[PDB]
């Protein structure tokens, strides 16, 4: 009814998406975690590997507080692109894909207290340097590294939502 559209229209009033939450008075804390749907092929010829991930971040933006009967607010992608989200990027990524079929494969939820939860579906090709001295008896530890591109340690800090071991969950069939 009218309450939903009114809250949606009145959230962005005076919102500046060029500025991170708590700019100049606190550090934006981002709780992140990953669900690996499939650990894709590992191409030792290219020293790369593919991984399909539900990558979901969460933070707090008091600018987007609201009140209503509803405690959860879903944002469409047009409005989700109109607010500040972390500029997370993969340090060892080569060519990653943000899925868009049939509509952008991302979601943005807002809680009444201003907590944002931002989920994405990604296919990331990442570098895996290999020591092939003991080939074919060799073993490797392929990394997946990510973080903010623009915001330094004193502005944005990432953390794991749960214990770090339990914050990256690989699917049984994946």
């Amino acid at each position, epitope marked *: 009814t009218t309450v939903f559209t009114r809250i949606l229209d009145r959230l962005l009033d005076g919102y500046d998406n060029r500025l991170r939450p708590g700019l100049g008075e606190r550090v934006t804390e981002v709780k992140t975690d990953i669900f690996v749907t499939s650990f894709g092929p590992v191409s030792d010829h290219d020293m790369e590997y593919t991984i399909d991930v539900f990558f979901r971040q969460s933070w707090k933006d008091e600018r987007l507080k609201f009140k209503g009967p509803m405690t959860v607010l879903r944002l469409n992608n047009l409005m989700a692109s109109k607010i500040w989200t972390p500029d997370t990027f993969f340090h060892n990524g080569k060519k990653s894909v943000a899925h868009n079929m049939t509509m952008p494969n991302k979601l943005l939820r807002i809680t009444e207290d201003g907590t944002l939860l931002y989920t994405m579906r990604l296919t990331v090709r990442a570098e895996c*340097p290999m020591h092939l001295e003991d080939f074919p008896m060799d073993a490797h530890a392929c990394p997946l590294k990510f973080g903010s591109y623009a915001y330094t340690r004193a502005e944005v800090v990432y953390e794991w939502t749960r214990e770090p071991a339990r914050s990256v969950v690989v699917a049984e069939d994946g």
Partner: nanobody, 108 residues
Framework: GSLRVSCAAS????????MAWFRQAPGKEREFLAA???????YYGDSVRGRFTISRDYAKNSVDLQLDGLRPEDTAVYYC?????????????????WGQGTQVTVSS
């Protein structure tokens, strides 16, 4: 006090390997301190987070550890390690190469 412990590797180029420092106090327990990667990413242990700083000179193939805010309880033997971190990056079993070690004592 302030101190700096350097580690020079000879016989192999560890540009693509992870170079780390470990500590062993009396009692036979080896403790992870710091590690640095080919991507220049610094990992630290909780006990020495923000106190000890790890750096690598890839041209010289060396790894340095700057120790600051020493305390009497920090007396121990410090070991330099290298090797790709398989099942590890915080476990001594994942490192194939180790050095003689250096003794450190602090008196108050």
């Amino acid at each position: 006090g302030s101190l700096r412990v350097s580690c020079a590797a000879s016989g192999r180029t560890f540009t693509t390997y992870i170079m780390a420092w470990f500590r062993q106090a009396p009692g036979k327990e080896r403790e992870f301190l710091a590690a640095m990667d080919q991507g220049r990413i610094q990992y630290y242990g909780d006990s020495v987070r923000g106190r000890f700083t790890i750096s690598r000179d890839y041209a010289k193939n060396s790894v340095d550890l700057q120790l600051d805010g020493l305390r009497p309880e920090d007396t121990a033997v410090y070991y330099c390690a290298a090797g790709a971190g398989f099942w590890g990056l915080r476990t001594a079993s994942s490192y194939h190469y180790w050095g003689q070690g250096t003794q450190v004592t602090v008196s108050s």
